[PDB]
């Protein structure tokens, strides 16, 4: 009985693969050969921020292009003024096992999550003069892996139980749930339009959701290993994924297929973060080789190297205006590059 | 030349001082990871130690040391992903139920041989030793381990299963403190304390430059 619909699904995959292959009239790798490369790129650590004392995990740039958020195994969620190294807040967490963080676009909220399965939202503009827990969202059955703000009232999250959800903060309930992954989802990233987002899971599949209908609208399967980080191309038409196979891959949302792959023969370690620059010409990624490497997104050449950490990097992010890029490692330091 | 943000600068310095003073106080505790199969004596050992849908952090103090005793078994997801978070724990409080083995052994092999835990020692509490006597009297262990030979006796059975656990270690650089649970307490705490003292001495003597 089930075998009939199983064969129907198999035929569906065969025909969708045929259609996907039919769209490959050319490739970006051969079209791009007409344009010149960006040349060799180098950068220096303009600041070394060393407030933390144990194993920074995740970070996020504020909208003001000035304020940083970072979280560590030490249990201190502290936010930094990048221009002048000053601390401005130290938020003591109820549990030290953090794995992700997010800074709201308006700057009024910072969100934290970890193995405790609960997402806690901290308010910054309280009249009392100190931060306080606005809400503690609950309902998941697996470790949180990424949090992002659509606005001050709606937060989206990705968890270790193979589901993603969108929360109405003012009511503390999962207003819409996204499902269909086989493995658990490791990271999440939402488009500038805020209408649609992607997430990657340990089953090597990365797929596109929309935040209003809740349907899974596209699925990509290029990798061979667990997905570990995703970030959109700045114009919202494409995104790149990092995987634990030393190769970063770029997918196009309208072609619905892989366009190019970034790899080099001497690297075998796993990816930990991915993020484009403001123009989209440059793709920055983190590695377990204790360093950071930057690729020309349209040439797939290792145009530069950003080494300088004593331990593997675990987070990365460029500013919303492209002025600088920040990265953090288990050595408990954040570097600022230009 | 600084503006009147000197107050912000001094506030940042105060935050740094407070963070350092909190970290130095927090560093005094010893961190343990408690692990095992479901029902495999975790509840028994924590209860006899006489002292939220995911991780749970038991906490108790003994001999001027505060033991943070984390139980990660509550979570149900890909172990290979979240396991790296518990790096730098001083020891693993592993425990198995003797009355129940062929998958607990695989889990122990995975944990002891993991990339991250290459250097950390392991305490291995054999549990349910009391009713294991009834188990061995009522049924032979050969149905569990066909390769076994020799007498069906309590002490040799315990020694053989302990050797089976011990043999799966790949590197001689780590110790494995096996001990019986005896469901009576007031002694296993001394065992874990001795293991922690050995680990502290080893770490201090390695860092100070004798290794």
């Amino acid at each position, epitope marked *: 009985e089930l075998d009939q619909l199983r064969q129907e699904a198999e035929q569906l995959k065969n025909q969708i693969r045929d259609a996907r292959k039919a769209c490959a009239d050319a490739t970006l790798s051969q079209i791009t050969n007409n344009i010149d490369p960006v040349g060799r790129i180098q950068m220096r650590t303009r600041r070394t921020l060393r407030g933390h004392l144990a194993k920074i995990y995740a970070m996020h740039w504020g909208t003001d292009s000035r304020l940083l958020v970072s979280a560590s195994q030490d249990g201190k969620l502290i936010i930094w*003024d990048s221009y002048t190294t000053n601390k401005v807040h130290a938020i003591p967490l109820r549990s030290s096992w953090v794995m992700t963080c997010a800074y709201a676009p308006s700057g009024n909220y910072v969100a934290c999550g970890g193995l405790d399965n609960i997402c806690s939202i901290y308010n910054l503009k309280t009249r009392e003069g100190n931060v306080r827990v606005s809400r503690e969202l609950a309902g998941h059955t697996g470790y949180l892996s990424c949090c992002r703000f659509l606005d001050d009232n709606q937060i989206v999250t990705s968890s270790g139980d193979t589901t993603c959800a969108l929360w109405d903060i003012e009511t503390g309930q999962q207003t819409t749930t996204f499902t269909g992954h086989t493995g658990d989802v490791m990271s999440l990233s939402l488009a500038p339009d805020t209408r649609l987002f992607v997430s990657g899971a340990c089953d090597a599949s990365a797929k596109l959701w929309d935040v209003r209908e809740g349907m899974c609208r596209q699925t990509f399967t290029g990798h061979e290993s667990d997905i570990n980080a995703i970030c959109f191309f700045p114009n919202g038409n494409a995104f790149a994924t990092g995987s634990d196979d030393a190769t970063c891959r770029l997918f196009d949302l309208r072609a619905d297929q892989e366009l190019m792959t970034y790899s080099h023969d001497n690297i075998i370690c796993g990816i930990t973060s991915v993020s484009f620059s403001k123009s989209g010409r440059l793709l920055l990624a983190g590695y377990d080789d204790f360093n950071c490497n930057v690729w020309d997104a349209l040439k797939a050449d290792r145009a530069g190297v950003l080494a300088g950490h004593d331990n593997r990097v675990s987070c990365l992010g460029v500013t919303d205006d492209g002025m600088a890029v920040a990265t953090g490692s288990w050595d408990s330091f954040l570097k600022i590059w230009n | 030349l600084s503006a009147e943000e000197r107050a*912000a600068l001094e*506030r940042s310095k105060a935050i740094e001082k407070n963070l350092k003073e909190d970290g130095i106080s927090a560093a005094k505790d010893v961190k343990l990871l408690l692990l095992g199969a479901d029902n495999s004596g975790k509840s028994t050992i924590v209860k006899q130690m006489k002292i939220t849908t995911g991780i749970v952090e038991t906490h108790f103090t003994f001999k001027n040391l505060h033991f943070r005793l984390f139980d990660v078994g509550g979570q149900r997801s890909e172990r290979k992903k979240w396991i790296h978070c518990f790096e730098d724990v001083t020891a693993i409080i592993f425990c198995v139920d003797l009355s129940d083995m062929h998958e607990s052994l695989m889990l122990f092999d995975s944990i002891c041989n993991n990339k991250f835990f290459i250097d950390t020692s392991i305490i291995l509490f054999l549990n349910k030793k009391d009713l294991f006597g009834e188990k061995i009297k009522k049924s032979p262990l050969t149905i569990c381990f066909p390769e076994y030979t020799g007498p069906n006796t309590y002490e040799d059975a315990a020694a053989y299963i302990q050797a089976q656990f011990e043999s799966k270690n790949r590197s001689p650089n780590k110790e494995i403190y096996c001990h019986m649970t005896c469901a009576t307490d007031t002694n296993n705490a001394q065992v874990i304390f001795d293991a922690v003292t050995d680990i502290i001495i080893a770490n201090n003597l390695r860092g100070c430059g004798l290794y």
Partner: single-chain antibody
Amino acid sequence: DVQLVESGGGLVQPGGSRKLSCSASGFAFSSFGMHWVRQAPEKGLEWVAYISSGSGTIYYADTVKGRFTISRDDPKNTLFLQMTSLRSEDTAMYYCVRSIYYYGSSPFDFWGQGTTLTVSSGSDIVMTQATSSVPVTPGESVSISCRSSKSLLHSNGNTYLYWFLQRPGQSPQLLIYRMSNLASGVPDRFSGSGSGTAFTLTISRLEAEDVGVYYCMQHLEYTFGAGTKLEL
């Protein structure tokens, strides 16, 4: 809610001494700095003393230094000012005011009720204001201006102007800080503007709730304008 209250007023013999204290509740006092400012019955505001969080720093006005001293007791959430050698110039109400300093924060956001004190007979950048008062009617728009002897703009890109409102029979309230940002809870119809040494506060769709006196303030370095009145 947040409450700042003070006590110790009344009358003083000339040349005597009096302890004045401030009481705070509803907020983490230890994380905030505190200023003490005073208002003569026939003059504008004048600054007196300041201490940062944790009592790490302290400042006094040159005309009040030595005669007065201030300190705070964080566990009791109380602030103390000790007065000695009181003279006729010292008669005024004294306001206990809140402050906090970090990027994006707004100082001087809340003011206490104040205590009256009277006595019987026995680098200083100056701010200027164009007029003592102007007439206005509800529904119209009017502009207020103040000027500084030195440029209040700083090399970091900010300018440290502040505008305060004091309604009759009430304590002051913060309207505009950093010369362009509106304080929390202030109606959106207030707005400041200016550059260099010439600064202007503007109001449109004026309402009877805006009738009062406006005090121009600077905060660049270690003063208040004479104040201007709005009459319906």
